């Protein structure tokens, strides 16, 4: 398990605002959002930006 | 042949842009390839070119020219843009050929 992840065609994009910058209201739409482990970063020439 | 190479230097002098202090490349009509080529020039080469041109235009408005000493000499004319222009055209042809394909 030396995997940096296993310890720690598709894809949807997004968009924000620059210059200065650019909802969760129940334990349900928040659970699983507490940094599993490290942070990865991806970029594809053909798909959305990824982050863990 | 090293003959027509005598022709070149002849023409170069006949043309007369060197009398304004312009380099051969400074005289290129700015079509699209040239437009792009210039955008790729290093800051310094770009500003040097800019002054040379603004200088020629001032001469042209004055109906004067540079003192013989200051004329660009055939063998000292820097073809600074040709390398870039050559590339901009290669890329374009590639894309062109690839899009018909």
């Amino acid at each position: 398990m030396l995997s940096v992840a296993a310890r720690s065609x598709x894809x949807x994009x997004x968009x924000x605002x620059x210059x200065x910058x650019x909802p969760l209201l129940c334990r349900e739409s928040m659970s699983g959002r507490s940094a599993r482990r490290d942070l990865v970063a991806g970029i594809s020439l053909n798909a959305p930006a990824s982050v863990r | 042949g090293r003959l027509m190479d005598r022709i070149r230097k002849w023409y170069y002098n006949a043309a007369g842009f060197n009398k304004y202090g312009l380099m051969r490349d400074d005289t290129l009509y700015e079509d699209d390839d040239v437009k792009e080529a210039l955008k790729r020039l290093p800051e310094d080469l770009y500003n040097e070119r800019m002054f040379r041109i603004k200088r020629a235009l001032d001469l042209s408005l004055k109906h004067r020219i540079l003192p013989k000493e200051q004329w660009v000499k055939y063998e000292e004319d820097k073809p600074y843009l040709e390398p870039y222009l050559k590339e901009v055209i290669r890329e374009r042809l590639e894309r062109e050929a690839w899009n018909k394909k």
């Binding site: 065609x9 598709x10 994009x13 129940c26 | -």
Partner: protein
Amino acid sequence: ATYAQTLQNIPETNVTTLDNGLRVASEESSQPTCTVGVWIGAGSRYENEKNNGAGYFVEHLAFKGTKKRPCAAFEKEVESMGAHFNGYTSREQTAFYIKALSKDMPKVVELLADVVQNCALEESQIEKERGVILQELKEMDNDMTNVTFDYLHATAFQGTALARTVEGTTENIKHLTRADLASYIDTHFKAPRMVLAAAGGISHKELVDAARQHFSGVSFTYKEDAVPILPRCRFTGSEIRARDDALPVAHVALAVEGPGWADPDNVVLHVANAIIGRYDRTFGGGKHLSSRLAALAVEHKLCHSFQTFNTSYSDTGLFGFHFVADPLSIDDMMFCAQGEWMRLCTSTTESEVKRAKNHLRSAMVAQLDGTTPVCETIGSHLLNYGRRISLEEWDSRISAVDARMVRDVCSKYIYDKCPALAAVGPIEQLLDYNRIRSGMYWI
């Protein structure tokens, strides 16, 4: 080894039907881990005015335990065996599936069955989910992309079942009864309308055995084994414009009526969508992307993103596209987009299709990357196509598509049609249905 062959070596999908009518299917692999779940042909389209949202309210309680074992027990029993329990509910399809080690396969089935059959529906829990759901509505209300697709449906199929949201209405959630939820489960979660799907390292025979065991109840009458055909939904060329200039960017979604699962044209349509493709500001390809619309989008900064979609249903569907863009570039984007659609009906090249097919092939293969996605495919295939369609078959269909074909199919569904339009946000620059309508003809 060639692509041709690898497609053949793929282990076939075994399907066997029980007595009550339930169907059992699986694709066995060498994998130690796996996924199994039940895919039900039931959703919001099956609901009515007063019970809209039941299928969703149910989806929330489907995990708060059964009668055989209350909440804490149920959860503890699932967690402590390292299995993942998840699910969903759409308009024409619901599903509850589990991810675990091939070993537990049988205990899993028992649990699946206990949920779809004995959901406790404890009343104290219902008064809690009421707030939970209400809260998820306010959160989902801030997701423009979804607010936009719901509006698209709400207008495209106005006055029908498909016009409803899956989560239902505020009033319904506030007043649904222990009864209604029970009634929904009883009326809808039934054997002939369900499919037990499994993918991973499991034995079909072993699987079907477990089924017979916990999927008991057999039917007496003829009505209990009849799978009801739903009243058809009427499509309407229209538009809904929700304007709020206080929102950062605009969302626009435009679409025409699709054929529905069964139709072979769906293959071509997907190839078509492959030509127009999709895009978003983090695509590294940039100005070189093969998609003409993506290219222009980059050249002229037309949008933050765009995507084409071929949402199929049993008897109908929606074929369109959706984009997000700044208030002042909506017009040009729409213009260029409708442009590309007309190009589809009139000038598609063999070059464009060759690539589209390759993109579509890779796409279908990518939908079978893991046990959960392969299980999802089986569940849906049986439920929608009444059987499984292999990659070997799909690929054949895809290889049959050519420019000529794409043109004729797109012309058939797009050319001179009255689209449905949903626009949300600072949409002033996009305007007049009439103008949008004229964009539906002349390359």
